[PDB]
């Protein structure tokens, strides 16, 4: 039922998910001048050398690449985190035009898209249990700007024609998520939520300062996907982003000066 349209979009979500108006919702505007440099923050540890991608799926809200999270193969640790977080999946949010699409904003600037690498804390054993905990998930967010192509994204965009509509999926092995990362691991961090229903307040957000560049042709392939199932009226999967939510009683910390 929920989606991104006029009648079922983000302003409606609180009716099914009342935490939508809670105290630690995501995304937020990152006011770069108000973020506090915290010299006690550690460098982020991203260990993706043994990542095993499995499948790529159109879920009717975005597309996602799912990983084998049954062992510690692709993990996030360090930064603001305590313990080890396993990579479950990545997905994107994007716009109908290049001036919107990101969920987080930086001094009110919207990027063309935002990549989310979703990880869960191994202390809770499974993602279902982790979503019920205030430190259950760590999501690494990366902004996409339009310019030069990202070579490491191309394997992903080339299979999107095979998952056009909601419910389609395909085998998607040997995809290396290291090829989606920018040079710097400088980050902002704050406590927040899932940006899609159920909007659970379980996420340590880690948002990279450095965007990656993708080409117009790459982002145009995102915009050919459909929210609808095959046999329903065609509704392009664009503008699948939640807008910035109130910061309330939170401080955004920066790993860098
Ligand atoms: N946009 S985001 O905040 O990166 C989404 C983060 C969570 C994605 C993975 C999920 B959410 B809860 B638990 C796990 B199951 B249920 B719903 B289902 B989706 B998958
Ligand atoms: Zn997301």
110-147 b/e (C-beta count within 10 Å ≥ 16 → b): bbbbbbbbbbbbbebeebeebbeeebbbbbbbbbbbbe
Smallest CA-to-CA distance from 167 within 93, 90, 104, 231 is with: 231
Residue with CA nearest ligand 1 atom 16 = 128
116 is in an annotated binding site: yes
Cα–Cα dist 131/133, whole Å: 6
Maximum C-alpha span of the chain: 54
Task: Count the neighbouring beta carbons within 10 Å of the beta carbon of residue 46.
Answer: 21
Cα–Cα dist 64/139, whole Å: 14
Q: Which ligand is nearest to the CA of 194?
A: 1
Please give the C-alpha separations between residue 142 and each of 105, 117, 184, in angstroms, as whole numbers: 11, 8, 11
Do 149 and 217 touch, CB atoms closer than 8 A?
A: yes
**Gaps (C–N > 2.5 Å) in the chain: which residues precede them?**
none
119 is in an annotated binding site: no
Task: Count the neighbouring beta carbons within 10 Å of the beta carbon of residue 61.
Answer: 17
Cα–Cα dist 175/53, whole Å: 6
Structure tokens at 23: 């105290």
* Alpha carbon 72 to its chain's center: 20
- Pocket residue to mutate for ligand 1, from 131, 198, 240, most atoms within 8 A of Cβ: 131
Residue with CA nearest ligand 1 atom 14 = 127
| DSSP string across 12-60 | GGGGT-GGGGSSS-S--EE-TTTSEE-TTPPPEEEE-TT--EEEEEE-S
Q: Which ligand is nearest to the CA of 195?
A: 1
The number of the ligand 1 atom at minimal distance from the alpha carbon of 130 is 13
The number of the ligand 1 atom at minimal distance from the alpha carbon of 193 is 3
Total structural domains within the chain: 1
User: 56 φ, ψ to 5°?
Assistant: -125, 135
Cα–Cα dist 226/132, whole Å: 31
How does strand 36-37 pair with strand 253-254? Answer: parallel
104 is in an annotated binding site: no
What ranges in the chain are assigned the alpha helix state H?
A: 127-130, 154-158, 216-222
Residues with CB under 6 A from ligand 1: 116, 118, 127, 131, 139, 194-196
What is the CA(218)–ligand 1 centre distance, in A? 24
Residue with CA nearest ligand 1 atom 4 = 116
Range of the structural domain that residue 141 is part of: 1-257
Cα–Cα dist 102/148, whole Å: 18
Contacts 24+ apart (CB under 8 A), 133-138: 133/202, 134/191, 134/201, 134/202, 135/82, 135/202, 135/204, 136/200, 136/202, 136/203, 137/85, 137/194, 137/202, 137/203, 137/204, 138/76, 138/81, 138/85, 138/203, 138/204, 138/206
Q: Which ligand is nearest to the CA of 138?
A: 1
User: 217 φ, ψ to 5°?
Assistant: -65, -35
Do 94 and 112 touch, CB atoms closer than 8 A?
A: yes
Structure tokens at 189: 């961090």
Cα–Cα dist 75/15, whole Å: 35
204 is in an annotated binding site: no
Q: What is residue 237's three-state secondary structure?
A: coil
CB-side neighbour CA atoms (13 Å) of 243: 9
In eight-state DSSP terms, residue 161 is G
């Amino acid at each position: 039922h929920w989606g991104y349209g006029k009648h079922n979009g983000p302003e409606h979500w609180h009716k099914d998910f009342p935490i939508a108006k809670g105290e630690r919702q995501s995304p937020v505007d990152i006011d770069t001048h108000t973020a506090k440099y915290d010299p006690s923050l550690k460098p982020l540890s991203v260990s993706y050398d043994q990542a095993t991608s499995l499948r790529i799926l159109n879920n009717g809200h975005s597309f996602q690449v799912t990983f084998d999270d049954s062992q510690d193969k692709a993990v996030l640790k360090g930064g603001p985190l305590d313990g080890t977080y396993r990579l479950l999946q990545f997905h994107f949010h994007w716009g109908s035009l290049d001036g919107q699409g990101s969920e987080h904003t930086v001094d009110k600037k919207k990027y063309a898209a935002e990549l989310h690498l979703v990880h869960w804390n191994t202390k809770y054993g499974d993602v279902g249990k982790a979503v019920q905990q205030p430190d259950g998930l760590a999501v690494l967010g990366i902004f996409l700007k339009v310019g030069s192509a990202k070579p490491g994204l191309q394997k992903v965009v080339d299979v999107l024609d095979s998952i056009k509509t909601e419910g389609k999926s395909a085998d998607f092995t040997n995809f290396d998520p290291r090829g989606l990362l920018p040079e710097s691991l400088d980050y902002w961090t704050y406590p927040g939520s899932l940006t899609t229903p159920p909007l659970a307040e379980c996420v340590t957000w880690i948002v990279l300062k450095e965007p990656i560049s993708v080409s117009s042709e790459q982002v145009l392939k995102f915009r050919k996907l459909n929210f609808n199932g095959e046999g329903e009226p065609e509704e392009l999967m664009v503008d699948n982003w939640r807008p910035a939510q109130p910061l309330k009683n939170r401080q955004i910390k920066a790993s860098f000066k």
